[PDB]
Design an enzyme around this catalytic site. Structure first.
Site, PDB file in Angstrom:
ATOM      1  N   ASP A 133      -1.318 -23.625 -14.682  1.00  0.00           N
ATOM      2  CA  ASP A 133      -1.177 -22.169 -14.690  1.00  0.00           C
ATOM      3  C   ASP A 133       0.122 -21.705 -14.037  1.00  0.00           C
ATOM      4  O   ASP A 133       0.113 -20.790 -13.207  1.00  0.00           O
ATOM      5  CB  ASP A 133      -2.380 -21.510 -13.997  1.00  0.00           C
ATOM      6  CG  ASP A 133      -2.374 -19.985 -14.139  1.00  0.00           C
ATOM      7  OD1 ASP A 133      -1.665 -19.470 -15.037  1.00  0.00           O
ATOM      8  OD2 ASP A 133      -3.072 -19.295 -13.359  1.00  0.00           O
ATOM      9  N   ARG A 137       3.861 -15.285 -10.761  1.00  0.00           N
ATOM     10  CA  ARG A 137       2.877 -14.813  -9.798  1.00  0.00           C
ATOM     11  C   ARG A 137       2.398 -15.925  -8.865  1.00  0.00           C
ATOM     12  O   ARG A 137       1.871 -15.616  -7.792  1.00  0.00           O
ATOM     13  CB  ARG A 137       1.670 -14.195 -10.508  1.00  0.00           C
ATOM     14  CG  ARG A 137       0.744 -15.231 -11.132  1.00  0.00           C
ATOM     15  CD  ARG A 137      -0.475 -14.644 -11.837  1.00  0.00           C
ATOM     16  NE  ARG A 137      -0.939 -15.589 -12.854  1.00  0.00           N
ATOM     17  CZ  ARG A 137      -0.543 -15.567 -14.123  1.00  0.00           C
ATOM     18  NH1 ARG A 137       0.289 -14.631 -14.538  1.00  0.00           N
ATOM     19  NH2 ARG A 137      -0.985 -16.473 -14.979  1.00  0.00           N
ATOM     20  N   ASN A 138       2.567 -17.198  -9.258  1.00  0.00           N
ATOM     21  CA  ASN A 138       2.145 -18.374  -8.495  1.00  0.00           C
ATOM     22  C   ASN A 138       3.266 -19.014  -7.691  1.00  0.00           C
ATOM     23  O   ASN A 138       2.977 -19.778  -6.763  1.00  0.00           O
ATOM     24  CB  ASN A 138       1.576 -19.453  -9.441  1.00  0.00           C
ATOM     25  CG  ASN A 138       0.300 -19.024 -10.084  1.00  0.00           C
ATOM     26  OD1 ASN A 138      -0.470 -18.263  -9.497  1.00  0.00           O
ATOM     27  ND2 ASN A 138       0.054 -19.495 -11.288  1.00  0.00           N
ATOM     28  N   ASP A 151      -0.405 -23.038  -5.783  1.00  0.00           N
ATOM     29  CA  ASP A 151      -1.638 -22.938  -6.549  1.00  0.00           C
ATOM     30  C   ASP A 151      -1.775 -24.034  -7.598  1.00  0.00           C
ATOM     31  O   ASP A 151      -2.516 -23.871  -8.568  1.00  0.00           O
ATOM     32  CB  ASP A 151      -1.754 -21.563  -7.213  1.00  0.00           C
ATOM     33  CG  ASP A 151      -2.406 -20.535  -6.303  1.00  0.00           C
ATOM     34  OD1 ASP A 151      -3.047 -20.948  -5.312  1.00  0.00           O
ATOM     35  OD2 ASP A 151      -2.295 -19.323  -6.579  1.00  0.00           O
TER      36      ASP A 151
HETATM   37  C1  LIG Z   1       2.542 -11.908  -6.661  1.00  0.00           C
HETATM   38  C2  LIG Z   1       1.288 -12.575  -6.138  1.00  0.00           C
HETATM   39  C3  LIG Z   1       0.597 -11.809  -5.014  1.00  0.00           C
HETATM   40  O1  LIG Z   1       0.663 -10.594  -4.949  1.00  0.00           O
HETATM   41  N1  LIG Z   1      -0.090 -12.494  -4.043  1.00  0.00           N
HETATM   42  C4  LIG Z   1      -0.809 -11.842  -2.980  1.00  0.00           C
HETATM   43  C5  LIG Z   1      -2.184 -12.463  -2.752  1.00  0.00           C
HETATM   44  C6  LIG Z   1      -2.546 -12.110  -1.308  1.00  0.00           C
HETATM   45  C7  LIG Z   1      -1.330 -11.434  -0.713  1.00  0.00           C
HETATM   46  C8  LIG Z   1      -0.217 -11.982  -1.576  1.00  0.00           C
HETATM   47  N2  LIG Z   1       0.043 -13.351  -1.170  1.00  0.00           N
HETATM   48  C9  LIG Z   1       1.050 -13.853  -0.371  1.00  0.00           C
HETATM   49  O2  LIG Z   1       1.890 -13.043   0.059  1.00  0.00           O
HETATM   50  C10 LIG Z   1       1.256 -15.224   0.043  1.00  0.00           C
HETATM   51  S1  LIG Z   1       2.521 -15.771   1.169  1.00  0.00           S
HETATM   52  C11 LIG Z   1       2.007 -17.480   1.099  1.00  0.00           C
HETATM   53  N3  LIG Z   1       2.545 -18.523   1.748  1.00  0.00           N
HETATM   54  C12 LIG Z   1       1.979 -19.718   1.513  1.00  0.00           C
HETATM   55  C13 LIG Z   1       0.881 -19.933   0.671  1.00  0.00           C
HETATM   56  C14 LIG Z   1       0.330 -18.845   0.009  1.00  0.00           C
HETATM   57  C15 LIG Z   1       0.915 -17.592   0.238  1.00  0.00           C
HETATM   58  C16 LIG Z   1       0.536 -16.321  -0.323  1.00  0.00           C
HETATM   59  N4  LIG Z   1      -0.559 -16.495  -1.149  1.00  0.00           N
HETATM   60  C17 LIG Z   1      -1.198 -17.719  -1.449  1.00  0.00           C
HETATM   61  O3  LIG Z   1      -2.145 -17.723  -2.209  1.00  0.00           O
HETATM   62  N5  LIG Z   1      -0.765 -18.926  -0.830  1.00  0.00           N
HETATM   63  C18 LIG Z   1      -1.376 -20.097  -1.187  1.00  0.00           C
HETATM   64  C19 LIG Z   1      -1.084 -20.646  -2.464  1.00  0.00           C
HETATM   65  N6  LIG Z   1      -1.557 -21.788  -2.963  1.00  0.00           N
HETATM   66  C20 LIG Z   1      -2.408 -22.522  -2.221  1.00  0.00           C
HETATM   67  C21 LIG Z   1      -2.910 -23.843  -2.796  1.00  0.00           C
HETATM   68  C22 LIG Z   1      -2.261 -25.148  -2.200  1.00  0.00           C
HETATM   69  C23 LIG Z   1      -2.742 -26.444  -2.798  1.00  0.00           C
HETATM   70  C24 LIG Z   1      -0.715 -25.156  -2.233  1.00  0.00           C
HETATM   71  C25 LIG Z   1      -2.719 -22.047  -0.928  1.00  0.00           C
HETATM   72  C26 LIG Z   1      -2.229 -20.864  -0.403  1.00  0.00           C
HETATM   73  C27 LIG Z   1      -2.580 -20.372   0.977  1.00  0.00           C
END
Ligand SMILES: *CCC(=O)N[C@H]1CCC[C@H]1NC(=O)c1sc2nccc3c2c1NC(=O)N3c1cnc(CC(C)C)cc1C
Length: 270
Positions: A133, A137-138, A151
């Site tokens: 995916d 956005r990811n 993700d």
């Molecule tokens: C454009 C997408 C969006 O608006 N996302 C929002 C969802 C909640 C608030 C926004 N997210 C984030 O700002 C951030 S900053 C950051 N740093 C590190 C990891 C993450 C992260 C986010 N959101 C996340 O989901 N993750 C994250 C991503 N993927 C995983 C899976 C592992 C296996 C890498 C884990 C995390 C915590």
């Protein structure tokens, strides 16, 4: 320590500092691990994920490590909701970052974002790990402006059926090749297609792909062999690279290794 496997983080070691917002799996927070190390914490809302399967896969993901791949530090599983702990990406998701016009990006910076993602995807491909995916956005952006892939593989554990098949109202139609839309044939070449769309998002400063179409119309467009077209900020050489990801025949699409070489060539030439 006692009671925690190598893939397991003790939640008592976490200090929660700021709420970043709510995603599809739930709330994401910024915090510290053992007082010193920045981490992101994703709290998996209950009923959303296939948790036992995810946890087994988390053990494999612990071994994935690359400068351009968001690093998994571990999971907190003794509890509800479970936590996914990762390195922290201070500038948030690439999609919203691209849409902030104040950044006034040079095209050299846009190509560097593509290269960032391409190196991570070549690494995942070298481990036979599909993202499944990939989209702006990811991808995430750290405090230095470096883009990293996140993700990865997580769609396999989503329980909401609206997300998991093309019939679903939340499936990533606009990032999917015709063989996914028609037959659900996932492969390294469906990641390649999605990367091409990601390159388009980057050079479009975060526009929605096929922004004037519905998902259903997008599927028909793609099925009839029609494609996205050249963003104003993409040179002819850059457009050739992203367009090469969209061959109707999956086996005529490049690998991430070939794309990386093509991107480096354009960086040299431009
Ligand atoms: C454009 C997408 C969006 O608006 N996302 C929002 C969802 C909640 C608030 C926004 N997210 C984030 O700002 C951030 S900053 C950051 N740093 C590190 C990891 C993450 C992260 C986010 N959101 C996340 O989901 N993750 C994250 C991503 N993927 C995983 C899976 C592992 C296996 C890498 C884990 C995390 C915590």
């Amino acid at each position: 320590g006692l009671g925690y496997g190598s893939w397991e983080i003790d939640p008592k070691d976490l200090t929660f500092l700021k709420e970043l917002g709510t995603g599809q799996f739930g709330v994401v927070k910024y915090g510290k691990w053992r007082g010193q190390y920045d981490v992101a914490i994703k709290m998996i809302k209950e009923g959303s994920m296939s948790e036992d399967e995810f946890i087994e896969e988390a053990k494999v993901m612990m071994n994935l490590s690359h400068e351009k791949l968001v690093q998994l530090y571990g999971v907190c599983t003794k509890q509800r909701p479970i936590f996914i702990i990762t390195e922290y990406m201070a500038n948030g998701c690439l999609l919203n970052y691209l849409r902030e016009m104040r950044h006034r990006f040079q095209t050299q910076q846009l190509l560097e974002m593509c290269k960032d993602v391409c190196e991570a995807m070549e690494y995942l491909e070298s481990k036979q790990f599909l993202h499944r995916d990939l989209a702006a956005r990811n991808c995430l952006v750290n405090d230095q402006g470096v883009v990293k892939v996140s993700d990865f593989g997580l769609s396999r554990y989503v329980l909401d059926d609206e997300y998991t098949s093309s019939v679903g109202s939340k499936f990533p139609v606009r990032w999917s090749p015709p063989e996914v839309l028609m037959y659900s044939k996932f492969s390294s070449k469906s990641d390649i297609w999605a990367f091409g769309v990601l390159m388009w998002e980057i050079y479009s400063l975060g526009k929605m792909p096929y922004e004037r179409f519905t998902n259903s119309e997008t599927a028909e467009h793609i099925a009839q062999g029609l494609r996205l077209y050249r963003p104003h900020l993409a040179s002819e050489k850059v457009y050739t690279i992203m367009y090469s990801c969209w061959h109707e025949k999956a086996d005529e699409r490049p690998t991430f290794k070939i794309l990386l070489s093509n991107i480096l060539d354009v960086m040299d030439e431009e």
